[PDB]
Amino acid sequence: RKETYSSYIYKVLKQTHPDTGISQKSMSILNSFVNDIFERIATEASKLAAYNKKSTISAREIQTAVRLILPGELAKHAVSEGTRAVTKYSSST
Amino acid sequence: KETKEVYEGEVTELTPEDAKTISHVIVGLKSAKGTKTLRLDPTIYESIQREKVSIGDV
């Protein structure tokens, strides 16, 4: 048993490019890329939460970590996508 | 010699009353100087539903 993200990112590619094939090595690069991005974002958030003497990770410290890591227009588009996703998910009423 | 009589304004109330056949319909109009409530026979009500009139139309 081993874990990969392959079906999800495959679906992401079929949403915008239906007639496009895939090399397995390309999944190896892109899986390493998404794991590396998750890696830096998560330890930046943990480092920031350890700074503020807090024991809890919420949306705001990863928001600040996204603002710290990503370039500015990617930062603003990423926080736009994240805020609309978390407000859609938070409307469970 | 003829006489022209005109009601116009926003519809605020459209309540038909029966006795499958509507006996009458009460329409309440509204303008900038006040409101007015009118009774109507079903013949005009058929023309009203011909025009697809809902609440809030002029």
Binding site: R67, A75, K76, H77, V79, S80 | -
Partner: protein, 125 residues
């Protein structure tokens, strides 16, 4: 003179701890600060406790029965920057704007965090 005018008007209207305007007995109790947010909370929980005791009795005039209901008519939309009639709305930060020049100069190249303060005015943050 300037420094002593406040002293003169302070000692003119000074009342000691044995205040003559009080009663013979005082017995001053201890009270919490009890901010205005939590007063609504425990009044609401007292009302709910009384209601669930009485059920297992309608209220007449409470602090929550007097409060006005929301409107039935649709609310008008205004531009968040100028206060004029807001025709459009940006898809990124959900800010209503009036025309193209406001969008090009203010709404699109706006600093992060100011959009939430703009939405704070109509309570949409």
């Amino acid at each position: 003179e300037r420094l002593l005018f406040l002293r003169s008007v302070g000692e003119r209207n000074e009342i000691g701890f044995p205040s003559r305007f009080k009663s013979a007995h005082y017995k001053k109790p201890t009270r919490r600060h009890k901010s205005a947010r939590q007063l609504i909370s425990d009044e609401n929980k007292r009302i709910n406790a009384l209601l669930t005791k009485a059920n297992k009795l309608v209220p007449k005039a409470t602090y929550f029965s007097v409060e006005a209901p929301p409107s039935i008519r649709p609310a008008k939309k205004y531009c968040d920057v100028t206060g004029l009639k807001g025709f459009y709305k940006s898809p990124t930060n959900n800010i209503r704007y009036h025309n193209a020049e406001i969008y090009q100069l203010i709404v699109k190249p706006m600093a992060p965090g100011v959009d939430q303060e703009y939405l704070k005015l109509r309570g949409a943050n």
